[PDB]
Amino acid sequence: ARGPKKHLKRVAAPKHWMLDKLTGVFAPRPSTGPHKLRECLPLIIFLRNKLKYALTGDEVKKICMQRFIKIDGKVRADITYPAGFMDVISIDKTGENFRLIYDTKGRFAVHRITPEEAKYKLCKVRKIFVGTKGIPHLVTHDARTIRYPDPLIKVNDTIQIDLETGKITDFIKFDTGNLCMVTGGANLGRIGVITNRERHPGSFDVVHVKDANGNSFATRLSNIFVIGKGNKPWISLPRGKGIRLTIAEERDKRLAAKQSSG
């Protein structure tokens, strides 16, 4: 090409959108924004496919152009706006609040929260930076700058921000025995307690994490997001609490529930 691309073919689209093959040729190329294009979920896909309020692109346009949807306490009338990990989608008229967090599998969960919980979010810090006159800056995972942070917060800590003011309330420090969700790799959406961090000068540091049932799994430090102190989640977790039971167990649970149901 001779410039930035604008189309996204339906086959080349990120898989965890769970797009069918025979509907169309193109997929909603997510508008540039806070989250990455492969790690986002466009407002059109979340609104029409998961909740199934809208039936088509026109209905998604009509639902959002009435200023109804509000991503992180700020109104967004953009259908391809990238709503990503740790966001508070607040549909006001139905009186529902959704938080985008990874299901036990590699996909986003339709996870409803309470309006008291829908007033903060849990941001990971990406870089700490000294300003133009010794004014320290944070830069979080969702491309959000906060200046004059806590002098203690460092480059892999999690912060809790208020959603209107956009300022730090608390922070969870990156160390052993802290709840972490995995936000990349094959272990995408596993909730576990940090066991060991292994430094690799030049390469990517690999972090060993232990699940709630003594299941142990590693992932490179880029794909970790601490969401709790000790074993205490600071937000509500989805049904399953990021365990990933085996296909043998998932088969047993499915058919056993079916037998008892009838």
Partner RNA sequence: UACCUGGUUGAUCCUGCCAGUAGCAUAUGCUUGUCUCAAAGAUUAAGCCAUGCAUGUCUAAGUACGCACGGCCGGUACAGUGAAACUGCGAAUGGCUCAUUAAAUCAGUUAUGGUUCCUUUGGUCGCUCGACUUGGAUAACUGUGGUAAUUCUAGAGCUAAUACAUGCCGACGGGCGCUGACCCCCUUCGCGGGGGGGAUGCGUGCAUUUAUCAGUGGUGACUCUAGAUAACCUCGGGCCGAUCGCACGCCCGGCGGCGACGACCCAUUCGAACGUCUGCCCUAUCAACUUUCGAUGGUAGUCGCCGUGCCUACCAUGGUGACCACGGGUGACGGGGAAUCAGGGUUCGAUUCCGGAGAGGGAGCCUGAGAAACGGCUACCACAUCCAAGGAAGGCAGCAGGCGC
Partner RNA sequence: AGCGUAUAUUAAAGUUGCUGCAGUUAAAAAGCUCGUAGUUGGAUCUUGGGAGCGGCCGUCCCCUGCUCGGCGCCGGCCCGAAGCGUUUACUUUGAAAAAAUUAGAGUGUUCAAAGCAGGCCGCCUGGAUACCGCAGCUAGGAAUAAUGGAAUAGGACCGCGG
Nearest to 84 by CA among 127, 29, 46: 46
Here's the x/- map for RNA, 47-86, by CB under 7 A: it reads as --xx-----------------------x------xx----
d(CA 100, CA 90): 11
Q: Does 163 bind RNA (CB under 7 A)?
A: no
The two structure tokens encoding residue 100: 């985008």
Rank residues 1 and 55 by Cβ distance to RNA and give the closer one: 1
Rank residues 151 and 230 by Cβ distance to RNA and give the closer one: 151
Q: How many residues lie near RNA (CB under 7 A)?
A: 83
* Residue entry with tokens 């870089």: 127
- The strands making up 168-172's β-sheet, listed across from edge to edge, are 145-147, 136-140, 120-130, 158-162, 168-172
Q: Does 200 bind RNA (CB under 7 A)?
A: yes
Q: Which of 146, 159, 172, 191 lies at the binding interface for RNA (CB under 7 A)?
A: 146
Nearest to 122 by CA among 171, 164, 84, 73: 171
Q: Does 160 bind RNA (CB under 7 A)?
A: no
Q: Does 21 bind RNA (CB under 7 A)?
A: yes
How open is the CA angle 100-127-85, to the nearest 5 degrees?
5
Q: Does 37 bind RNA (CB under 7 A)?
A: yes
Q: Which of 24, 57, 145, 236 lies at the binding interface for RNA (CB under 7 A)?
A: 145
